[PDB]
Amino acid sequence: EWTARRLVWVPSELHGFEAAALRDEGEEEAEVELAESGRRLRLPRDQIQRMNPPKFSKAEDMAELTCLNEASVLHNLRERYYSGLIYTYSGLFCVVINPYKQLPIYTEAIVEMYRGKKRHEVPPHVYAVTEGAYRSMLQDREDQSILCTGESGAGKTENTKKVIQYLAHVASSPKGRKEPGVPGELERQLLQANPILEAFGNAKTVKNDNSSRFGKFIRINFDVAGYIVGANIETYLLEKSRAIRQAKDECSFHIFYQLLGGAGEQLKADLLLEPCSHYRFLTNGPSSSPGQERELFQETLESLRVLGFSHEEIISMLRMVSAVLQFGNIALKRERNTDQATMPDNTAAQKLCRLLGLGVTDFSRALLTPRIKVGRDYVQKAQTKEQADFALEALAKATYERLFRWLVLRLNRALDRSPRQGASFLGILDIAGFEIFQLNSFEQLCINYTNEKLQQLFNHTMFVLEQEEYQREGIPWTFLDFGLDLQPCIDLIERPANPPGLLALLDEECWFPKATDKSFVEKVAQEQGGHPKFQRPRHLRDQADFSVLHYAGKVDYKANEWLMKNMDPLNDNVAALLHQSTDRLTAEIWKDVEGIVGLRRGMFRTVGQLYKESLSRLMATLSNTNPSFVRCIVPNHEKRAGKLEPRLVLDQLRCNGVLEGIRICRQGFPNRILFQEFRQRYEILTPNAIPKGFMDGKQACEKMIQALELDPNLYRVGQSKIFFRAGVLAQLEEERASEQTKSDYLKRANELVQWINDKQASLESRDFGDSIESVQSFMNAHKEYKKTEKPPKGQEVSELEAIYNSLQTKLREPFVAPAGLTPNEIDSTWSALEKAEQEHAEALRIELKRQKKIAVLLQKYNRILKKLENWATTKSVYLGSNETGDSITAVQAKLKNLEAFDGECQSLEGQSNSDLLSILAQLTELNYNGVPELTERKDTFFAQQWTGVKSSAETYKNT
Ligand SMILES: [Mg+2]
């Protein structure tokens, strides 16, 4: 139905791309109707871009879209952004758009939600990127790097702080978090290090209010247990000229403002601070935003306190800040009849010397008439007002720079600790972004060159390294050219020789005795005029010296003071004095003196040379890391929230190579696995694929693939690993987890049935033992079994029933079907176990009744016989015959009553037969009858001892 709408994207000048209903189609032309206005339009068919259906709305990973083109990528980012979803994946990398407002997406609860989660399990975020790199380092034991690309004010710095916040939270050891909830020393410091560098190295530019005027690479060192043990900070190229002058609507470093607006009456007194309008070096007067400085100053002071800094350390730094400023209040003039620089007012040099721990005279003579060394002697030379004013500015810039250098060294002293970093680190690159101002100088050339190099590092990692790895593994692959290669520009700028580049042309020019900024411009237009990335200025148009076609745009360069900013000259006389300074800080910062003194090319490294050398060191360090890219995008040029500018976002996506990176992810194989890891990981999926001992990686994987019946186009067997298309491993991990649960359920449910069927057979045997003590034992056992063995099993019935329903719902393809082991049939056999339990205990009660009915009948029987045995044997006293006359007749009278003994024989035989009658009706041990009958035969015998004593008593008597 959605497809019947015939919806397509067409180019739009205002909106970039806009929805249109495809009205009709030709081989050349196409007619569309705009969705918004209903306007009909005829346009060439090529310009039409296929649109994704609404199920792809606010898609997390763009590499999943059916139709991948500029218009859909733009629309997916725009829809996500206007929902407050600033992060989006694009194949192996992440895209972020700066909102320009506070968003509730960086809390401690959101940090916890990312921990131990897979990239697809959680929405796109900087935390997931951080987590991925952190987990990759922990598993592969490899050094990782997170690289934030982006132009000025895109969000690199803000994102960098979020990486640090994630790692400091999730990767702090039990040491440094002795007590839960309380961050320890290392965590607190690690997080207070960036605000400190931002106070001394950030400034408001037209592009960003908190612009980083230096680059930084931060290394976080971890222990073999994956816990943070230290951090190291590398800074690159501070824009030290911002200390002396700033352009329209721009400010100097923030610290300058925080100190002047935020200090107390006594701190203004002890550091000799003056109002803002009084400083020459603060080009645009008073702070753009005042009052808030008291607050920001106090925060900088507190951060410095969190770091190791002592009160004398902090005071010494602020005194150096005031000293950099005071250099600019020295009003030099010329002489009335000579160009010699004079100092008619010495109040500012009095103040400057007090703050720098020097001698006023020494300073003045060294600044105004510096002594130069030549041929084993010293020559005092005069300086003009310009020469001397330049020296002042060079000294104030060199002092701010050295203060910053010391600041970094100190943070590394606090932060850098425990070198037992466990063969790993996580590098976070935060370089100064690509920038275009009204005037682009040497500083801009240096920043833009570094942005060019990072973009090329993305090109090399995504398209060169990717494809070279396929060639190296013998995979069927034809090289794809995405047209992303920055060699022409990078080379024009940095090539040292053969045709030398701009930086090398600058180096040679400066070391020339008569060279001038103008002659450099002439040399560079002559030598480089024909390069496709260099452009000479056009007459009546470009006020600039030359243009460079950077990847992110054409930038016009004014070479004003480039020979000097590259050669970086300083007064030898003043530098020596600062080295011999009374003050501890000044002397410490000024302790290294190796620079160009007043004076083949030479033996001194230029700023260009030194920065090229430092960037190459950073590149070689990054080359031995597994990088993760974060492409920061600025929505608009107005610092406005909720205002995405399509044409600005499109340019950025274009120079960044965002679509090409996504395409190399869909067209290539982004996931690779070693043969040993594949076999080990997915052997539950192919139980009978590999036989016995195979002793081989490539073939063992080849048999498993064959057994899995995987699509040929979803994988490629290489020389050491298997390459897969995106999402193939993620689905095998779910299939393996499915089989793991299926195997565990099948094992337990088979053991449960084996147990309940064995106990059922023990409950229905009907053989208790014929003893009351045996029938008691069966009752004692069953009652314990009901409250010892039963409960755990009953619980296993409820546990497996839950597991089965959870594994059923989990299958998002074929549902598990097992035999006789369904949870419903587990219930039906357990109900039969309980039905056997009731019928066992009841048969035990009936048995107990009967067994005790038999014991009563036996004791009644044995008591009767015992009395019979006793009476008949006590009757043995019949033997005595010792009597006289008159005793026999009395005995014969007592023998008559004794014939009432049959009265016993009537009752006893009547009782025994009744006992034995009751017995028969139940159970039988009738050996008894033989017993009583023999006692009846023994009773007859004594019945002969009746007549045996009657006849023996019979005597002759009466004679
Ligand atoms: Mg920044």
Numbering used by the authors: 49 to 647, 663 to 875, 880 to 1026
Quoted from the paper:
Nonmuscle myosin-2C, the gene product of MYH14, is one of the slowest myosins-2 as its steady-state ATPase activity lacks potent F-actin activation. Together, these signatures qualify nonmuscle myosin-2C as a dynamic strain-sensing actin tether. The overall topology of NM2C shares the structural four-domain architecture of myosin-2 motor domains comprising the N-terminal subdomain (Nter), the upper 50 kDa subdomain (U50 kDa), the lower 50 kDa subdomain (L50 kDa), and the converter that terminates in the lever.
We determined a 2.25 Å pre-powerstroke state structure of human NM2C, one of the slowest myosins-2 characterized. Crystallization in the presence of the ATP analog ADP⋅VO4 was achieved after truncation of the flexible N-terminal 45 residues extension and the fusion of the NM2C C-terminus to Dictyostelium α-actinin tandem repeats 1 and 2. NM2C pre-powerstroke state characteristics include a closed conformation of the nucleotide-binding motifs switch-1 and −2 in the active site. The coordination of the co-crystallized ADP⋅VO4 is similar to other myosin-2 structures in the pre-powerstroke state. Residue R788 at the interface of converter, Nter, and lever is highly conserved in nonmuscle and smooth muscle myosins-2 and the only connecting hub between structural elements of the L50 kDa and the Nter in NM2C.
